[PDB]
């Protein structure tokens, strides 16, 4: 009776990031990263 | 349309090549999903790889990478004429030929 409440849908998100400012002490190029629970994380994947 | 089985796992026609017998009428002229079993909201169970047996013990309603195999039960009635059966042992005598 609980394994057929499971079930799955695709979800859409979209984020756009206009500017960013007040860094300090910035030794190296930035790069930011941004995953949905275990979905998106560079280094859990090969290919996305 | 090889996929369709009776409870022995013996070959049958698709749902919707299904005909209506002699003496009878369709209930339901279109098969009924059965969500009344042990299957997910689209009426789906899932099972691992069919073993060497082919015959699969164990479905269950929750989708897994694991389970290679997706099955459903349909539902459809019928209804006879209200007036006699002698019409049924008509077809019914050639149970083997």
Same mark, same amino acid.
């Given at each position: 009776?609980? #394994?057929?409440?499971?079930?799955?849908?695709?979800?859409?998100?979209?984020?756009?990031?206009?500017?960013?400012? +007040?860094?300090?002490?910035?030794?190296?190029? &930035?790069?930011? #990263?941004?995953? &949905?629970?275990?979905?998106?994380?560079?280094?859990? +994947?090969?290919?996305? | 349309?090889?996929?369709?089985?009776? /409870?022995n796992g013996e070959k049958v026609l698709p749902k919707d090549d299904i005909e209506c017998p002699?003496? !009878?009428? @369709?209930?339901?002229?279109? @098969?009924?999903?059965?969500?009344?079993?042990? /299957?997910?909201?689209?009426? @789906?169970?899932?099972?691992?790889?069919?073993?060497?047996?082919?015959?699969?013990?164990? !479905? /269950?309603?929750?989708?897994?990478?694991?389970?290679?195999?997706?099955?459903?039960?349909? /539902?459809?009635?019928r209804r006879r004429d209200l007036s006699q059966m002698e019409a049924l042992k008509r077809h019914?005598?050639?149970?083997?030929?």
């Open positions: 009776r609980v #394994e057929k409440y499971l079930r799955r849908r695709k979800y859409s998100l979209f984020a756009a990031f206009y500017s960013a400012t +007040m860094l300090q002490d910035v030794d190296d190029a &930035i790069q930011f #990263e941004v995953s &949905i629970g275990n979905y998106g994380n560079k280094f859990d +994947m090969t290919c996305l | 349309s090889d996929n369709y089985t009776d /409870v002699l003496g !009878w009428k @369709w209930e339901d002229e279109e @098969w009924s999903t059965d969500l009344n079993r042990a /299957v997910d909201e689209q009426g @789906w169970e899932y099972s691992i790889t069919i073993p060497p047996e082919r015959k699969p013990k164990h !479905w /269950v309603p929750a989708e897994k990478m694991y389970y290679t195999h997706r099955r459903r039960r349909w /539902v459809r009635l019914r005598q050639a149970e083997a030929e």
